[PDB]
């Protein structure tokens, strides 16, 4: 008759997990290499996916922490003394403008909350509430997008969470300054409904529930084959 407090939904699902690692440069190059983008979802990290897909419906708040580490870049014309690096982190709600390049107008939109962060301080954090039209997120959706019974199968538009975009505020004239971003994601005030059997087959697609047939368990020698045995000894005489 010992405690069960560690098996509750809160203590089971509120563990921070690293869900994205990206890199971006601070100088000339291909524009797509000068910013980092991520669409918020729980279907790309298999370890977190297996935990969220024990329940059919979920309702939680998001807490996102960004760890940013920058270093100098080898080449010619190295910077002898740089003041400090500042980074801009922008959260785009569902339906907001999304940048197609760095130094775009969407970076200065008043509907997108942004964080300006200087090197040396504590990691930046933000919290997003339960932002959806429906009354819950749904891990499994059996249905179509249009009512013609045709379209994308298994896609629901009621569980969009937005995007995260990170770039360098500074304009650098001497040298390049590569930076690396890590995203830590955590649910809070979690509520879950309608439990489901955990998955057996390995994941094959982030968008689908497709699978390969897998054996229901691990093989055994015989039906009456108990595990191994013990040799004769002082107790067994």
């Amino acid at each position, epitope marked *: 008759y010992h405690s069960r407090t560690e098996s509750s939904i809160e203590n089971f699902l509120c563990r921070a997990a690293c869900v994205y690692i990206a890199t971006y440069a601070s100088a000339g190059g291909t524009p797509t290499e000068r910013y980092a983008s991520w669409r918020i979802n729980t279907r790309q990290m298999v370890q977190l996916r297996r935990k969220f897909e024990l329940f059919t419906y979920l309702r939680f708040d998001m807490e996102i922490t960004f760890v940013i580490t920058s270093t100098q870049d080898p080449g010619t014309q190295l910077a002898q003394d740089m003041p400090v690096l500042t980074h801009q982190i922008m959260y785009i709600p569902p339906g907001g403008p999304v940048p197609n390049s760095a130094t775009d107008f969407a970076w200065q939109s008043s509907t997108n909350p942004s964080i300006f962060w200087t090197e040396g301080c504590a990691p930046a954090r933000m919290s997003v509430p339960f932002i959806s039209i429906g009354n819950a997120y749904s891990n499994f959706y059996d249905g179509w997008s249009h009512f013609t019974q045709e379209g994308v199968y298994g896609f629901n538009s009621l569980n969009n969470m937005g995007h995260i975009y990170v770039r360098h505020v500074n304009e650098q004239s001497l040298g390049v300054s590569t930076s690396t971003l890590r995203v830590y994601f955590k649910p809070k005030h979690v509520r879950a409904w309608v439990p489901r059997p955990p998955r057996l087959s390995p994941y094959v697609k982030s968008s689908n529930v497709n699978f390969k047939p897998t054996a229901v368990t691990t093989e055994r020698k015989d039906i009456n084959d108990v595990g191994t045995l013990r*040799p*004769v*000894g*002082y107790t067994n*005489h």
Partner: antibody, heavy 117, light 114 residues
Framework: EVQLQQSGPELARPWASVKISCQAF???????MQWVKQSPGQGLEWIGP????????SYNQKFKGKATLTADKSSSTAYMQFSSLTSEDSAVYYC???????????WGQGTTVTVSS | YIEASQSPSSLAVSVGEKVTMSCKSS????????????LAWFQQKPGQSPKLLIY???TRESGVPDRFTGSGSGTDFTLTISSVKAEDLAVYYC?????????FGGGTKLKIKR
């Protein structure tokens, strides 16, 4: 290199009790005494172990309900009784002793139990 | 420990002469409740496995020729062969299976006299 002896080979008759004794030169604590069957036709087959210091006696299923075992630790003599004796059971019975839980170190001398009906 | 003493020497007689031997036990070998004598006369061919002749001192083992007859009640135990053979060379023990331990006899070589 300790020697080992037994009761000895005697010419018996069918359905006549033959007790094959075995001498000892050790103690009687958590050790073991047993035998085999030395017949070229039947190869080597154990008959039953006896465990001084453990009070355990077992027989093979091939002779279960036919043979019995007894011993006297103080007297240093171990019996291996047999019933419903046949004529093809003749073998050079070897007395095996183990001073360990799991080993076979010292072997016997040799005794014959051949009969004529 | 309970042991038994065989004859001081071997048979050392001619071939074809009946031989009588005795086994002197150091303690009683009769269980009065069952009237059973727990001792047997053994025989070991040199190089092979041993094999007894008669068990319980009154029941000859099946397959044993009629030449061997074991007797003796109480502490004493004897045996008789009405026809000794030159192909029966072995070591004769008188082993007891009464109580722990199962001690053997003393040994008896079938030597050469011819």
């Amino acid at each position: 290199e300790v020697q080992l002896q037994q009761s000895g080979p005697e010419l018996a008759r069918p359905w006549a009790s033959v007790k094959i004794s075995c001498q000892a030169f050790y103690t009687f604590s958590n050790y073991g005494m047993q035998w085999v069957k030395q017949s070229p036709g039947q190869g080597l087959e154990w008959i039953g172990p006896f465990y001084p210091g453990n009070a355990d006696t077992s027989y093979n299923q091939k002779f279960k309900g036919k043979a019995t075992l007894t011993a006297d630790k103080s007297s240093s003599t171990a019996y291996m009784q047999f019933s419903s004796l046949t004529s093809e059971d003749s073998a050079v019975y070897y007395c095996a002793r183990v001073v360990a839980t799991t080993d076979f170190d010292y072997w016997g001398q040799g005794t014959t139990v051949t009969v004529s009906s | 420990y309970i042991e038994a003493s065989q004859s001081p020497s071997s048979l050392a007689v001619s071939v074809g002469e009946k031989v009588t031997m005795s086994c002197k036990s150091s303690q009683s070998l009769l269980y009065s409740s069952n009237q059973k004598n727990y001792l047997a006369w053994f025989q070991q061919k040199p190089g092979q496995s041993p094999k007894l002749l008669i068990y319980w001192a009154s029941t000859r083992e099946s397959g044993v020729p009629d030449r061997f007859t074991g007797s003796g009640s109480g502490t004493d135990f004897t045996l008789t062969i009405s026809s000794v053979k030159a192909e029966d060379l072995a070591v004769y023990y008188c082993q007891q299976y009464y109580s722990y331990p199962y001690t053997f006899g003393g040994g008896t070589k079938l030597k050469i006299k011819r």
